[PDB]
């Protein structure tokens, strides 16, 4: 045939879940676009990687129209 | 439009929402992340005369004097739907004057 | 028509059916209650009954109820009724599929042709007093090639058609035979 | 939470790995073996999973 070809698995998804402590920089979610959005103490980078901006717990916001966000609710 | 507002809010704190009517020029200093305004140095529907630019500058010193007596200092400026240039301009401009 | 209802609570919906009682439910803007007619009976009732004529339903509450079958879930795999929706009427206008009796033999069917009958019934907004045991259809001037729509109905007094005013009701399609066993063979 | 008296009556040789761990969690080693435990949700949780293996009794 002319098939049987493919690209190695990219292991993407939500890396931290709601209610996990995390340090600064922790990748929070790896993603195909903005399947999720940044938000509170949560930056994002070239690939759309979301990541903690300060240690603290993670939470997930649904906002319909506006899309889904992820934040760290800091504390120490 | 209002793209700007999104860009500002991201920064963190202390938006100065400069609204401006054809005869007026209000101005809130809104602390988002709770949905409350801190100071509210309006203008035409407040007290001051009728000359616009000189009015804006005067209402600039409005929020100014009103602010420090509370704590504010982050110039964080909602250059609202109106492009910063004149009335809006002078506004924050006076808020800087003191 | 009339059929003896019963009340239902905890009983295993499935264990019921083995007994013979087709479970169901009566509900309307104010009412919603678990029940279960009897199957052998519901058959006979609903055979003629269906969802045109109303059925008043008797509970051991004596209460005669002014309802008709809103919908019935049939079980796939050899037809049978699963359970029954019973819309309690009151008096305010209510929508419902009222029949259609197509009367007369059209120009089509005569010169060979076929009774195509898109809607063997139609949905109309109406109050319970008007249970128009049917509607007439002047199907007779119809020809193979022609079709009577919705905007062409003998509407009884006080009744308003709920469907789109342009839906087709029936039509007259050609027969079908061997001028299409030769031609349908090689040509394709 | 009265006592639960679980006995093992059907052998686990051939049930899922978990189900064996279940019995290890409850503390059943051998067959036809008695074992009494507090009716907490956790004990229940496992005792349920091996339901087809044990015979429970309330004590």
């Amino acid at each position: 045939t002319k098939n049987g070809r493919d690209s190695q698995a990219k292991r993407l998804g939500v890396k931290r879940y709601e209610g996990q402590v995390v340090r600064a920089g922790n990748i929070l979610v790896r993603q195909r676009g903005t399947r999720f959005k940044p938000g509170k103490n949560v930056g994002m980078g070239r690939d759309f990687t979301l990541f903690a901006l300060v240690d603290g717990v993670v939470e997930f916001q649904d906002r319909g129209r506006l899309g889904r966000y992820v934040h760290v609710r800091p504390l120490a | 439009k209002f793209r700007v507002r999104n860009r500002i809010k991201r920064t963190g704190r202390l938006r100065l929402s400069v609204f401006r009517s054809l005869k007026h020029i209000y101005a809130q200093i809104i602390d988002d992340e709770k949905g409350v305004t801190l100071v509210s140095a309006s203008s035409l529907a407040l007290k001051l005369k009728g000359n616009k630019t000189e009015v804006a500058r005067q209402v600039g010193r409005a929020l100014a004097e009103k602010a420090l007596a509370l704590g504010i200092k982050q110039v964080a400026f909602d250059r609202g739907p109106y492009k910063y240039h004149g009335r809006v301009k002078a506004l924050a401009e006076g808020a800087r004057e003191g | 028509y009339r059929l003896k209802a019963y009340y239902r609570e905890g009983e295993k919906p499935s264990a019921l059916r083995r007994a013979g009682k087709l479970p169901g439910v009566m509900y309307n803007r104010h009412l919603n209650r678990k029940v279960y007619v009897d199957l052998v009976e519901f058959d006979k009732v609903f055979r003629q009954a269906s969802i045109h004529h109303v059925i008043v339903l008797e509970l051991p509450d004596g209460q005669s109820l002014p309802t008709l079958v809103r919908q019935v879930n049939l079980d796939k795999r050899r037809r049978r009724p699963e359970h029954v929706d019973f819309f309690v009427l009151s008096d305010e206008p209510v929508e419902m599929y009222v029949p259609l009796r197509f009367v007369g033999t059209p120009a089509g069917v005569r010169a060979g042709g076929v009774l195509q009958e898109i809607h063997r019934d139609i949905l109309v907004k109406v109050s319970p007093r008007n249970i128009p045991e049917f509607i007439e259809v002047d199907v007779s001037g119809l020809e193979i090639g022609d079709s009577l729509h919705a905007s062409d109905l003998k509407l009884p007094p006080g009744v308003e058609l709920a469907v789109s005013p342009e839906e087709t009701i029936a039509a007259v399609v050609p027969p079908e035979d061997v001028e299409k066993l030769a031609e349908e063979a090689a040509a394709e | 939470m009265p006592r639960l008296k679980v006995k093992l009556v059907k052998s686990p040789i051939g049930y899922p790995k978990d189900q064996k761990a279940a019995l290890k969690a409850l503390g059943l080693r051998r067959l036809q073996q008695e074992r009494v435990l507090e009716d907490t949700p956790a004990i229940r949780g496992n005792v349920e999973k091996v339901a087809h293996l044990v015979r429970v009794e309330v004590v």
Binding site: - | - | V72, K76, Y97, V178, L181 | -
Partner: protein, 136 residues
């Protein structure tokens, strides 16, 4: 037709969606067993129908072969099947209503439909219309 080339086999689960109610003509023919029915099978019945009752009513065929059916050519294992020898089939679960006639007598249809189920590779029952629908 269209779409793309060849397609998995899949299984034939419970009779689920596979089934319903007469929905045009007077009488119906319904599937008891699950099956891939071939176009050459449909069409085989279709004709057997009319050819039986000439200048006849209207036969509605409500099953349709969108499944392309592969088949390697007497060799061994290299790649997917050339396929398509039996071309296409219709996935048909227990209870599906394949054909129904209209414009006919009870004994016209009780025949036509009878013959057809013969042409089919499956066990089938014939149907009326009782009342069973959805309305009020």
């Amino acid at each position: 037709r269209m779409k793309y080339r060849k397609q998995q086999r899949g299984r034939l689960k419970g009779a689920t969606k596979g089934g319903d109610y007469v929905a045009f003509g007077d009488f119906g023919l319904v599937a008891l067993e699950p099956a891939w029915i071939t176009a050459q099978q449909i069409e085989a019945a279709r004709v057997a129908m009319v050819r039986h009752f000439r200048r006849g009513g209207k036969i509605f065929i409500r099953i349709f072969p969108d499944k392309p059916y592969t088949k390697k050519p007497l060799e061994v294992r290299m790649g997917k099947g050339k396929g398509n020898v039996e071309g296409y089939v219709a996935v048909v679960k227990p209870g599906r209503v394949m054909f129904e006639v209209a414009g006919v007598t009870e004994e016209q249809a009780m025949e036509a439909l009878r013959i057809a189920g013969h042409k089919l590779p499956i066990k089938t029952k014939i149907v009326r219309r009782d009342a069973y629908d959805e309305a009020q």
